[PDB]
């Protein structure tokens, strides 16, 4: 059956080791982990992605889809971005989805789906682009606005994210909204909003899996 790797972005807790350089997959290095952002009230990105990721896991499991998580808690150091990608590749999953939230200007809001471009392998060139497009349509269908300050119509093909560069299986990274925006943060800070994000995410994952 289907297997999905879920990466709730960032760590449950950080230490100085997050500054260690790790490969990007395109030659250079970047920091092992970014700390992540937060809403104005202090709700951290790492907890938003963890709590939303658990709802996504529950939804996929309800469909009979086996899941794996990149980290097992929201209160301790987790793996660096290169390790998370190597872990995902070792599982050989049918899809990989990373969950993040952005820290942008307060008036900008909405989601963007990131994918590796230019592609480094045939999966990145084809299936992952299709996965990104399906996911963008699904978030829009849940009434999550496409970001009005970054990407293009809810999509962002890019070369600078190590986890996307290193993937050998279909992989996307979803920035679900801007934590600094009043409307997005109200969604993120509510259990009902996190469930609505997870509903969009599961429909995007299932839609992509059903085409493969
Ligand atoms: I570990 C990952 C997995 C899937 C998609 C993207 C990523 C990522 N890229 N940069 N940080 N995280
Ligand atoms: Zn992030």
Author numbering: 26 to 237
Please, what does the article write about this entry?
Amidases, also known as N-acetylmuramyl-l-alanine hydrolases, break the bond between the L-Ala and NAM, separating the peptide stem from the linear glycan chain. Gene analysis of M. tuberculosis revealed the presence of four amidase homologues: Ami1 (Rv3717), Ami2/CwlM (Rv3915), Ami3 (Rv3811), and Ami4 (Rv3594).12 However, the functions of Ami3 and Ami4 remain unknown. The crystal structure of Ami1 has been solved, and its PG hydrolase activity has been demonstrated in vitro. Furthermore, Ami1 is specifically required in M. tuberculosis during chronic mouse infection, as its amidase activity contributes to the pathogens ability to persist within the host.
In this work, we obtained the 3-D structure of the Ami1-5 complex at atomic resolution (1.45 Å). Compound 5 was localized within the catalytic groove, positioned at 4.3 Å from residue His125, which is part of the coordination triad responsible for binding Zn2+, along with residues His35 and Glu70 in the active site. Compound 5 is positioned within a hydrophobic core composed of residues Leu186, Leu189, Leu197 and Leu198, Val186, Ala187, Gly188 and Ile121. The phenyl ring is stabilized by π–alkyl interactions with Leu189 and Leu198, and van der Waals interactions with Asp32, Ile121, Ser123, and Ser196. The tetrazole ring is stabilized by Val106 (which adopts a double conformation) through a π–σ interaction, π–alkyl interactions with Leu196 and Leu198, and hydrogen bonds formed with the main chain of Gly188 and three water molecules. Finally, the iodine atom engages in an alkyl interaction with residue Arg109. Interestingly, a network of water-mediated interactions stabilizes the tetrazole ring of compound 5. These water molecules are positioned in the catalytic site, between the hydrophobic core and the coordination zinc triad. There is only a 0.7 Å distance between a nitrogen atom (N06) of the tetrazole ring in compound 5 and an oxygen atom (0 × 101) of iso-d-glutamine. This suggests that the presence of compound 5 in the cavity may hinder substrate binding, and, consequently, inhibit the hydrolysis reaction.
